[PDB]
């Protein structure tokens, strides 16, 4: 929860924070490598992927 | 025939919860060959009260059987997975899917269940409704005939919880048809590219002026059975015809019958309002009485 | 979800800056003045105020 | 079983954003124009049919994101550049509803059936933006025959009046640069076309200057007038 | 055997209580864990589940002869199973608070249904043996609600009140437009500028006075000719 709130600020400042997102083009999509957690964070971290890619541009 | 010792009662109130939404439980096995739910036959649970759930759970699984038909029907008629069904056939489902989420909001509120009677008696009124609301379309009426089946079914009051939901289905399924009414009487544009309503071209020869159209026939050529919408489409359907013929002659030079009767006389009023414009348009262009004296 | 709507308001701000960066790969003036005047001809004074700011600044 | 369900709802949440999931891997057809999802093995076919009815909303989301990121390769002055960027605003709005679904994921209240009821209004919205985006990609229509194609897609939609209201907003955002170029040609007489944005011939017995290269979607009397 | 008897009460088959569908029963008591007294009451408890599936066949035939009042009689009958099915779920939490309670309280709740369920089963059997069609089900239920049994006389008045609402629909729509909304001509007004209309005695209720029938007919015939 809060660790994802910290993870979004670092790609808002620049390039990836907690984990490696390996994508500098078409969006900086976030990979957690977890399947037992919900699907719900993947869309949210997809939207913060967009805004981090927008500020990298 | 004996199978094994009893399960728990709290496992029963969760298994009836799954068959209502359309999901198999540990005791429910959906059979695609019959499109029905199947409980195990014998002493497996069957009732902590001896052999009673063996019959009561079949009454609610059969009640759960009709719900997965309506969700099956709604997914197969959408025009993102099919391209052979009508727009009026699609609009009947659009009102059905609003009834599906009311079923989903009600099944999600049944915890905490006490016993199997407290849930089936809450859905005893809903049990009569779902049994009606599935097999009206299962015959196979389509489009305007499906619109004709639903108006008859909304006409079947002495039901007071089944009447407003079919009144709402008449309100939604007539939305594409009434959209094709006012574009035809105000400009004369035919709008649907694929519909249950038959399409005529109205091709006019340039050489002969005969009636600005030179052939029309009818799309309902001789039977003329325009059905089940307001006025009942027995006279005004012949005159939304002729005022639709003459609007583009201007161009290029408590009861389901009472609310039906409330749309009816406005549809009588505007055809007479378009008919009194083409009488004035004949007055200003023909000058017919001087030609009448000349003959 | 609350941080979504506090970042949905930059999502109007930075995305019309992304339409600004797609038009001009070059840095030569003159064609930059024809670029931002093709963005002030659009209505909707949300980014039209922002493209008027640079239209006072590329003209300067 | 419920821990494996909360396993699933996070894997569902990963594919709503357009991100590769945890136990759902994505196999690209030609580069994820159409996504063939590989979900993990089942020990229960009950939850397999629950995720099976959810994945068409990410199939339709993959087509529109493929097309609006193809608009960056459409980087010219054309009506497709303004249409898909307005589709990115609808994709921006689609991400608001998921972030509220994630804001509902702040504690355990959701199952596979619960969010499937919440994806129902956005399913028909995503499937009509899917059929528009694949039809603009096949023939590669350009300009006003584009507007003729969207108008047949509006005519083919006729019915579901709440959702022809959305693609009515889609076709007028596409016609929004097509109308700003017209007032210079109809009220000033001098045209400003970046790359064949309007139909024009260049301007004694000079020539006809008859032109129909865009084909405005309405009848033929306006294009001569 | 708590769950076995609530679910023998819902009407579904077993292999101890073998049931084919909707009409036939074999008792099959070679059972070791019930007593010879306790199978006699399961036959008393099955007779209240036998008429409950003699009831759903009356639903699916009409919902899902003919007439517009046959399914008007159907949303009368769903209200008599509704506290029945409400009582089926209150027995469910009885089996969860303590799963050791024996069957006599379940016998006790079904002695309460013992005078509601045959008393409506004798009604539908008298309905289907006269081969009734139209308004004369409503007159059959009116002399059935002429009877007493104070829980049951309200129940045959609730089944009376819902198909009187379909009667209430008819003379409301007939007096607004003059439109005869009938498909199987199930109304006493029948088409016999003026466009004469006529009466019908078999579709007229006899508790409505006979001299009232032309007051809706002839005024409704005269609103039809406009």
The whole-angstrom distance between D141's CA and the closest CA on chain B is: 20
The answer to whether residues D146 and D126 touch, using CB atoms and an 8 Å cutoff, is no
Nearest to B104 among D45, D117, D161 (CB): D117
Query: What one-character DSSP code corresponds to residue E211?
Result: G
Query: What one-character DSSP code corresponds to residue D42?
Result: P
CA gap E56, B128 in Å, rounded: 10
Interface probe for A, chosen from C5, C7, C8 (most Cβ of A below 10 Å), is: C7
For B147, how many CA atoms within 13 A lie in the half-sphere containing its CB? 27
Query: What one-character DSSP code corresponds to residue A57?
Result: -
Q: What is the SS3 string spanning chain B?
A: CCCCCCCCHHHHHHHHHHHHHCCCCCCEEEECCCCEEEECCCCCCCCCCCCCHHHHHHHHHHHHHCHHHHHHHHHHCCCCCCCCCCHHHHHHHHHHHHHHHHHHHHHCCCCCCCCCHHHHCCCHHHHHHHHHHHHCCCCCCCCHHHHHHHHHHHCCCCCCCCHHHHHHHHHHHCHHHHHHHHHHHHCCCCCCCCCCCCCCCCCCCCCCCCCCCCCCCCCCCCCCCCCCCCCCCCCHHHHHHHHHHHHHHHCCCCCCCHHHHHHHHHHHHHHHHHHHHHHHHHHHHCCHHHHHHHC
Tokens of B73: 């029907």
The residue with tokens 């999901």 is B23
| Chain B residue with Cα closest to E20 | B55
A23 touching D, CB under 8 A?
A: no
The answer to whether residues D17 and A46 touch, using CB atoms and an 8 Å cutoff, is yes
Tokens of B231: 């006025």
| Chain D residue with Cα closest to B30 | D46
- Interface size between B and E, measured as CB pairs under 8 A: 298
Q: Please give the C-alpha separations between residue B74 and each of B192, D26, D130, E8, E71, in angstroms, as whole numbers.
A: 22, 28, 19, 34, 25
The answer to whether residues A28 and D84 touch, using CB atoms and an 8 Å cutoff, is no
E20 touching B, CB under 8 A?
A: no
| Other C-beta atoms lying within 10 Å of the C-beta of residue E62 | 18
Which residues in chain C have their CB less than 8 angstroms from residue D92's CB? Answer: 8, 11, 15
B213-217: Cβ within 8 A, 24+ apart? B213/B245, B216/B245
Q: Is E72 helix (H, G, I), strand (E, B) or coil?
A: coil
| Chain A residue with Cα closest to D105 | A40
Please, what's the b/e burial string for A12-36 (b: 16 or more CB within 10 A of its CB; e: otherwise)? beeebbeeebeeeeebbbbbbebbe
Tokens of D170: 């889609």
| Chain B residue with Cα closest to E58 | B128
Nearest to A40 among D23, D69, D101 (CB): D101
The residue with tokens 């003699």 is E54
CA gap D1, B233 in Å, rounded: 57
CA gap E91, E96 in Å, rounded: 9
Any residues with CB less than 8 A from the CB of B84 and at least 6 apart, and which?
Answer: none
Of E186, E195, E201, the residue nearest E218 (C-alpha): E195
- Interface size between B and D, measured as CB pairs under 8 A: 54
CA gap B258, E172 in Å, rounded: 8
The whole-angstrom distance between A30's CA and the closest CA on chain C is: 16
CA gap B52, B62 in Å, rounded: 16
CB contact under 8 A, B91 and D160: yes
The answer to whether residues D24 and D37 touch, using CB atoms and an 8 Å cutoff, is yes
CA gap D35, D54 in Å, rounded: 13
CB contact under 8 A, B117 and E7: no
Q: What is the SS3 string spanning D122-133?
A: HHHHHHHHHHHH
Any residues with CB less than 8 A from the CB of E118 and at least 6 apart, and which?
Answer: E51
Q: Residue C35, class by beta-carbon neighbours within 10 Å (0-12 exposed, 13-18 middle, 19+ buried)?
A: middle
Any residues with CB less than 8 A from the CB of B270 and at least 6 apart, and which?
Answer: B185
D53-57: Cβ within 8 A, 24+ apart? D53/B75, D53/D116, D54/D12, D54/D112, D54/D115, D54/D116, D54/D119, D55/D15, D56/D123, D56/D127, D57/D16, D57/D119, D57/D122, D57/D123, D57/D126
Tokens of D138: 């096949």
Nearest to C41 among D75, D104, D180 (CB): D180
The answer to whether residues B142 and B85 touch, using CB atoms and an 8 Å cutoff, is yes
A47 touching C, CB under 8 A?
A: yes
Q: Please give the C-alpha separations between residue C46 and each of C8, C33, E157, in angstroms, as whole numbers.
A: 14, 20, 67
Please, what's the b/e burial string for D127-166 (b: 16 or more CB within 10 A of its CB; e: otherwise)? bbbbbbbeebeeeebbbbebbbbbeebbeebbbbeebbee
Of B248, B262, B252, the residue nearest B186 (C-alpha): B248
Helix %, strand %, coil % for chain E, to 5?
55, 5, 40
Question: What is the separation, in whole angstroms, between the first and last Cα of chain C?
Answer: 42
For E212, how many CA atoms within 13 A lie in the half-sphere containing its CB? 7
B84 touching D, CB under 8 A?
A: no
Which residues in chain D have their CB less than 8 angstroms from residue A34's CB? Answer: 10, 22
Please, what's the b/e burial string for E26-54 (b: 16 or more CB within 10 A of its CB; e: otherwise)? eeeeebeebeeeebebbeebbbbbbbbbb
For D37, how many CA atoms within 13 A lie in the half-sphere containing its CB? 27
Query: What one-character DSSP code corresponds to residue E18?
Result: E
Of E38, E47, E52, the residue nearest E104 (C-alpha): E38
Q: Please give the C-alpha separations between residue B272 and each of B228, B249, D121, in angstroms, as whole numbers.
A: 22, 16, 41
Tokens of B152: 């008859």
The residue with tokens 């629909």 is E169
Q: Is C16 helix (H, G, I), strand (E, B) or coil?
A: helix
CA gap B93, B100 in Å, rounded: 10
Of A29, B134, A43, the residue nearest D54 (C-alpha): A43
| Other C-beta atoms lying within 10 Å of the C-beta of residue B39 | 25
For B28, phi then psi, to 5°, come to -100, 135
Which residues in chain B have their CB less than 8 angstroms from residue E106's CB? Answer: 49, 52
- CA geometry: angle at B228 spanning B226 and B232, to 5°? 70
CB contact under 8 A, E3 and B52: yes
Q: Please give the C-alpha separations between residue E94 and each of B8, B48, E38, E105, in angstroms, as whole numbers.
A: 12, 11, 20, 10
- Interface size between C and D, measured as CB pairs under 8 A: 28
Q: Is C29 helix (H, G, I), strand (E, B) or coil?
A: coil
E141 touching B, CB under 8 A?
A: no
Nearest to B261 among E75, E84, E176 (CB): E176
According to the entry, how was the structure determined? cryo-EM
Tokens of E213: 């029938």
Tokens of B102: 């009311």
| Chain A residue with Cα closest to D11 | A39
**Radius of gyration of chain A from its Cα atoms, rounded to whole angstroms:** 10
CA gap E62, E122 in Å, rounded: 19
The residue with tokens 């260049």 is D202
CA gap A23, A28 in Å, rounded: 5
Tokens of E37: 């007294």
CB contact under 8 A, C21 and A57: yes
Interface probe for E, chosen from B13, B50, B120 (most Cβ of E below 10 Å), is: B50
Q: Please give the C-alpha separations between residue C55 and each of C10, C15, C32, C52, in angstroms, as whole numbers.
A: 21, 18, 9, 5
H-assigned helices in A1-57: 2-13, 40-56
């Amino acid at each position: 929860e809060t660790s994802l709130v910290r993870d979004l600020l670092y790609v808002f400042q620049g390039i990836d924070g907690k984990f490696v997102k390996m994508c500098n083009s078409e969006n900086c999509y976030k990979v957690d490598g977890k399947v037992a957690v919900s699907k719900s964070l993947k869309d949210i971290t997809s939207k913060l992927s967009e805004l981090g890619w927008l500020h990298n541009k | 025939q004996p199978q094994l010792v009893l399960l728990e009662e709290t496992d029963l109130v969760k298994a009836v919860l799954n068959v209502l939404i359309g999901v198999v439980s540990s005791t429910f096995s959906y059979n695609q060959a019959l499109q029905s739910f199947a409980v195990k036959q014998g002493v497996y649970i069957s009732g902590t009260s001896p052999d009673n759930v063996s019959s009561l759970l079949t009454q609610v699984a059969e009640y759960g059987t009709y719900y997965t038909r309506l969700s099956h029907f709604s997914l197969l008629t959408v025009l993102d997975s099919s391209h052979s069904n009508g727009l009026v056939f699609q609009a009947f489902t659009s009102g059905l899917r609003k009834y599906l989420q009311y079923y989903r909001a009600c099944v999600l509120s049944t915890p905490a269940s006490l016993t199997l009677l407290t849930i089936s008696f809450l859905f005893r009124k809903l049990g009569r409704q779902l049994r009606y609301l599935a097999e009206l379309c299962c015959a196979f009426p389509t489009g305007v005939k499906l619109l004709s089946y639903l108006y008859k079914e909304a006409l079947e009051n002495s039901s007071n919880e089944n009447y407003p939901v079919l009144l709402s289905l008449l309100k939604t399924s007539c939305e594409p048809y009434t959209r094709f009414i006012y574009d035809w009487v105000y400009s004369g544009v035919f709008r649907d590219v694929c519909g249950e309503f038959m399409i005529q071209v109205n091709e006019d020869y340039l050489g002969f002026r005969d009636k600005r159209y030179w052939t029309h026939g009818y799309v309902l050529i001789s039977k003329e059975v325009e059905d089940c919408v307001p006025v009942f489409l027995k006279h005004v359907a012949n005159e939304i015809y002729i005022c639709g013929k003459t609007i583009n002659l201007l161009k290029l030079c408590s009861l389901p019958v009472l609310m039906k009767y409330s749309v009816t006389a406005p549809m009588v009023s505007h055809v007479y309002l378009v008919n009194k414009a083409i009488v004035d348009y004949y007055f200003v262009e023909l000058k017919m009485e001087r030609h009448f004296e000349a003959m | 979800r609350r941080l979504l709507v506090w970042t949905f308001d930059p999502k109007i701000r930075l995305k019309t800056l992304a339409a600004l960066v797609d038009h001009c790969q070059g840095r030569k003036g003159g064609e930059l003045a024809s670029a931002v005047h093709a963005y002030t001809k659009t209505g909707d004074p949300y980014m039209r105020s922002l493209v008027q700011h640079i239209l006072g600044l590329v003209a300067y | 079983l419920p821990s494996q369900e909360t396993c699933l709802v996070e894997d569902l949440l990963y594919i709503l954003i357009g991100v590769d999931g945890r136990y759902i891997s994505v196999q690209p057809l030609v580069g994820r124009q159409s996504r063939s999802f590989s979900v993990e093995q089942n020990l229960d076919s009950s939850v397999k049919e629950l995720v099976n009815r959810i994945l068409p909303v990410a199939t339709n989301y993959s087509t529109v994101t493929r097309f609006v990121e193809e608009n960056s390769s459409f980087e010219y002055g054309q009506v497709n550049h303004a249409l898909g960027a307005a589709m990115r605003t609808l994709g921006k709005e689609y991400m608001i509803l998921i972030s509220q679904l994630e804001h509902l994921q702040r504690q355990g209240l959701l199952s596979l059936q619960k969010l499937w009821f919440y994806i129902q209004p956005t399913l028909r919205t995503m499937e009509v933006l899917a059929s528009i985006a694949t039809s603009l990609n096949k023939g590669e229509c350009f300009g006003g025959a584009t507007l003729s194609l969207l108008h047949d897609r509006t005519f083919g939609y006729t019915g579901d009046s709440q959702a022809q209201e959305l693609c009515l907003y889609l076709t007028k955002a596409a016609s929004a640069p097509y109308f700003d170029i017209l007032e210079r040609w109809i009220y000033r007489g001098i045209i400003n076309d970046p790359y064949s944005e309007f139909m024009v011939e260049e301007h004694w017995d000079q020539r006809y200057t008859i032109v129909q290269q865009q084909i405005p979607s309405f009848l033929q009397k306006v294009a001569d007038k | 055997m708590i769950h076995e008897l609530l679910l023998a009460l819902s009407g579904y088959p077993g292999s101890i209580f073998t049931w084919n569908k909707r009409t036939g029963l074999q008792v099959s008591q070679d059972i070791p864990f019930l007593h010879p007294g306790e199978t006699s009451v399961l036959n008393r408890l099955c007779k209240l589940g036998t008429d409950y599936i003699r009831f759903t066949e009356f639903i699916e035939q009409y919902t899902g002869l003919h007439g517009i009042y046959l399914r008007a009689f159907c949303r009368g009958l769903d209200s008599i199973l509704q506290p029945y099915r409400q009582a089926l779920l209150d027995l469910e939490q009885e089996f969860l608070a303590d799963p050791h309670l024996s069957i006599s309280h379940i016998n006790y709740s079904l002695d309460q249904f013992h005078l509601l369920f045959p008393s409506i089963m004798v009604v539908v059997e008298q309905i289907k043996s006269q081969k009734i069609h139209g308004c004369q089900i409503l007159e059959t239920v009116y002399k059935h609600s002429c009877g007493g049994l104070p829980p049951v006389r309200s129940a045959l008045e609730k089944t009376l009140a819902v198909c009187h609402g379909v009667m209430y629909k008819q003379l409301s729509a007939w007096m607004l437009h003059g439109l005869l909304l009938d498909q199987y001509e199930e109304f006493f007004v029948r088409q016999g500028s003026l466009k004469q209309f006529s009466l019908r005695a078999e579709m007229l209720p006899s508790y409505i006075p006979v001299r009232v029938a032309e007051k809706i007919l002839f005024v409704g015939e005269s609103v039809q000719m406009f």
